[PDB]
Amino acid sequence: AEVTIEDALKVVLRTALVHDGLARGLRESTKALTRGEALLVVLVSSVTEANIIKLVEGLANDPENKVPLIKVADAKQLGEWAGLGKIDREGNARKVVGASVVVVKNWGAETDELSMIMEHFSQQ
């Protein structure tokens, strides 16, 4: 590669993984969405009935300042970038079922990755 290709979301879910910025799970995520905390909502695509997708992008794009999103694919790898760790001979080695809706609360950090994604979804 050159620098990275959509790995800049991985680093931010890692910073909200270790330093407790993930409202991980749709219900706790919507508690961070029905709070001013959410300046990142990262959803997935292949879900069933599409109504919770409608929930996520509804509360993530509703008219209140509060419009965070970028976008990212499948649930279980999104949860792997997000917070649940059991590494154990680290070749992905897990019984993990998906997370599919994780929301970063303030991300507690800064530059090129996190400043890049804020520059990236803020200004085109």
Binding site: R27, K31, A32, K54, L55, L59, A60, D62
Partner: protein, 51 residues
């Protein structure tokens, strides 16, 4: 448990089961409907703020 936001067409949300009157409950959690009841479960027992 909480899929209950009646989010209308792309992308306005009408929040159902209107929310708790608590600073611990910063417009996030909801109030159950038992009987004469809307109920804060977050604080495990304390509030009957009911409509």
């Amino acid at each position: 448990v909480l899929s209950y936001y009646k989010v209308d067409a792309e992308g306005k949300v009408t929040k159902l089961r209107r929310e708790c009157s608590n600073p611990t409950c910063g417009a996030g959690v909801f109030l159950a409907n038992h009987k004469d009841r809307l109920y804060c479960g977050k604080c495990h027992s304390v509030y009957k703020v009911n409509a």
